[PDB]
């Protein structure tokens, strides 16, 4: 249902409207450069060097009987060297020969082939490829030997116990020189710090190095001989790729950093608040360094902002560090093991900036186009304003062009009951000119007083005025009332079509674009959970459950 029949009037007073002339453009972020440098948490255990001392006592049972010899007993007695004579094994590498042993007041002496109380030399033995370096001193009967061994060791993070590469575990901190409350659980009196006496590393025997201090703990069987250090040699932080050309952005809640080479983008929690380190004191030397250098090679483009190197902490746990630039004229952290969370953020950030600038314009180009559309809407009003004011407003209105403003009014409806039409376009005075439009007759609402007037375009009727043209030869033309058309051949209602199925013109530029369809993602995987367990060359769960199957035969019967 469209707008119905109506009649308009009142050129005098309505409301007032004026065409605008100065429509502006109501259009719709800052960023600093930087030199960031990021650290991750450390997992590598701490290491050092070590050297062990031991001395063997053997008891091998040889039997000389009647039928056959009985090669039976194999006895190991590794014995520990006292403190006051180890040093000769290090200086010119000479080894003591006899064993001196006391037991419960008694004293026993076991010489080695009527041995001497004076020392003997040694010789390096064979060994495995990149294995353990070890030197020996020999090339029920009794024989003995000394042994020295050189190897590596490693310990875990919160300093409970350190374990060598062979299995001689011993519960003590590697940083304990007395009078320092660290973790320590050995019994008593097994410590010595003989201050600055040197060890020579078997290439020569005469050179004198600095020779920092050394501890001499023995359990009772084997003497460990590492060298101690102060407890700033294990920083709990480690290095990573340092970028060069980042750019920062502060919006709303927190900051975003965006690099461009490693195409990542980190994100932090607080807003400005510079956290300061507490026990990360080792790493400040490396970062007071090497910020320069990266400052140095871009000297002709930027200046410093301030000396204050600031720190941050991100969500997954990676402490940052960076200093701002400007253009010029002329405990622990415990990070979470994954990539692809500092990676995905690029795919959502660097797609945001591209789409937003594309929608940056076309808000500009749409505005500039509408200024030119406004001007065309002025000159149409000077032709016939009663048509063009209707479509812009929304309903059937009327106006009558007073001066340089528009004269909006309100029309009165007419009853839908009885409409008429005239059967002849001829003026009923003579054989002269004719009307051009089919004048009709009508009546008001609820009063039944009938009038007549002229039907105009778009089923609007104004009264008390005619219009005509000169009659001529035969040329038909159509008209269009409510929901139908009907043809005049020359001056008669010759036909009535009553179908609005005559072909239209179809002027509509179809912006026929698309939607965005929703594909789903599969779940692929590069290295299965089962496959990781078979990666080790040893079968730890195969050895032990086989060893206690042929060793339950001690209970024979």
């Amino acid at each position, epitope marked *: 249902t469209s707008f119905p029949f109506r009649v308009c009037e009142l050129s005098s007073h309505g409301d007032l409207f004026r065409f605008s002339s100065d429509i502006q453009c109501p259009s719709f972020e800052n960023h600093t450069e930087g030199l960031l440098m990021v650290f991750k948490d450390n997992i590598i255990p701490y290491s050092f060097k070590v050297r062990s001392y031991t001395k063997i006592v053997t008891n091998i049972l040889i039997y000389n009987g009647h039928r056959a010899d009985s090669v039976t007993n194999r006895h190991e007695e590794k014995f520990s060297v006292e403190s006051y004579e180890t040093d000769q094994m290090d200086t010119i590498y000479q080894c003591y020969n006899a064993v001196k042993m006391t037991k419960d007041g008694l004293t026993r002496v076991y010489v080695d082939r009527d041995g001497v109380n004076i020392t003997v030399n040694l010789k390096p033995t064979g060994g495995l490829a990149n294995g353990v370096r070890r030197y020996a001193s020999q090339t029920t009967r009794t024989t003995v030997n000394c042994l020295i061994t050189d190897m590596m060791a490693k310990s875990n993070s919160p300093f409970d116990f350190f374990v060598t590469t062979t299995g001689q575990t011993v519960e003590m901190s590697p940083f304990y020189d007395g009078k320092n409350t660290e973790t320590f659980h050995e019994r008593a009196d097994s410590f010595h710090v003989r201050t600055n006496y040197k060890i020579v590393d078997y290439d020569n025997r005469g050179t004198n190095p600095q020779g920092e201090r050394r501890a001499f703990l023995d359990k009772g069987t084997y003497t460990l001989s590492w060298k101690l250090e102060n407890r700033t040699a294990y920083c709990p932080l480690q290095h990573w790729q340092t970028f060069d050309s980042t750019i920062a952005t502060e919006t709303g809640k927190s900051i975003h950093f965006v690099t461009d080479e490693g195409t990542s983008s980190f994100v932090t929690n607080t807003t400005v608040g510079i956290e300061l380190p507490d026990a990360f004191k080792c790493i400040e030397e490396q970062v007071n360094k090497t910020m320069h250098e990266k400052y*140095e090679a871009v000297q002709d483009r930027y200046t410093k902002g301030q*000396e204050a190197i600031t720190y941050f902490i991100t969500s997954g746990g990676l402490l940052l560090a960076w200093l701002p630039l400007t253009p010029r004229s002329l405990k622990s952290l415990g990070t979470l093991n994954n990539p692809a969370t500092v990676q995905i953020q690029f795919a959502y950030d660097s797609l945001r900036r591209q789409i937003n600038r594309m929608l940056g314009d076309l808000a500009r180009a749409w505005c500039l186009e509408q200024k030119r559309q406004n001007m065309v809407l002025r000159e149409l009003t000077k032709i016939n304003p009663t048509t063009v004011m209707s479509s812009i407003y929304g309903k059937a209105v009327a106006a009558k062009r007073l001066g340089d403003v528009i004269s909006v009014s309100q029309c009165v409806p007419v009853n839908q009951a009885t409409v008429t039409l005239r059967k002849s376009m001829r003026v009923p005075g003579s054989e002269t000119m004719c009307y051009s439009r089919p004048l009709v007759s009508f009546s008001f609402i609820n009063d039944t007083k009938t009038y007549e007037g002229q039907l105009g375009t778009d089923n609007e009727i104004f009264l008390t005025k005619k219009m005509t043209e000169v009659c001529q030869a035969t040329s038909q033309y159509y008209f269009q009332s409510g929901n139908e058309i009907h043809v005049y051949n020359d001056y008669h209602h010759f036909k009535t079509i009553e179908l609005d199925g005559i072909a239209t013109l179809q002027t509509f530029i179809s912006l026929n674009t698309s939607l965005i369809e929703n594909i789903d993602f599969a779940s692929l995987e590069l290295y299965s959970r089962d496959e990781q367990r078979a990666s080790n060359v040893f079968d730890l769960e195969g050895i032990f459950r086989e060893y206690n199957f042929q060793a339950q035969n001690i209970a024979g019967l």
Partner: antibody
Amino acid sequence: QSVKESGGRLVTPGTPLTLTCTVSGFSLSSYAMSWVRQAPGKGLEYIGVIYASGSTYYASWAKGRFTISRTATTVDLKITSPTTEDTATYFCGRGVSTNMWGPGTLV
Amino acid sequence: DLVMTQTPSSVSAAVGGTVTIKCQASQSLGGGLAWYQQKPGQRPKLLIYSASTLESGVPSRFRGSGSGTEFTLTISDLECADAATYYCQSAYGPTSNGLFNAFGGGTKVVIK
């Protein structure tokens, strides 16, 4: 890493002598290098710089006396018009600070 | 270009003492400068950059401070092996009226 020096001989003042060496250790494309000279009796004097963007600059006393150019693996120095009391010794920078100088050489 | 000012050509006291090699310049410098030290015949070697910190390897006997124009150097404990000439170097990069990076003069100590 270090860098080296090649030159000397103390040729006649008619020679347009060249003075080059720069070797290895690291990428040359993203740092800075600089020349500096020592003379007996006196101290030292800053010569020139070359920055990572590719431009060069020169000091405030020898504004046409020298020229520096990067060869993407080596950098050099050309002296235009020698005289009899300017040339004593020369160096090799590796930045503006933080010693990576090396042995140097004598004219 | 401005010229450095490197006045006091002092002498040492006995070992285990203090000296002061304070120098200055004649412009608004900005960020920081440097301080080298070299024995006769060899390459240079630096100690302090940006008037603030030491470097790894050189012990903590030296220090330094100051901001703007005047800049103070203080050695302590005076081991006799360390006695040579000292210097100063500005590092500020190009701006208006040319460069700002040149050495200044010379100052040596004499061990007693």
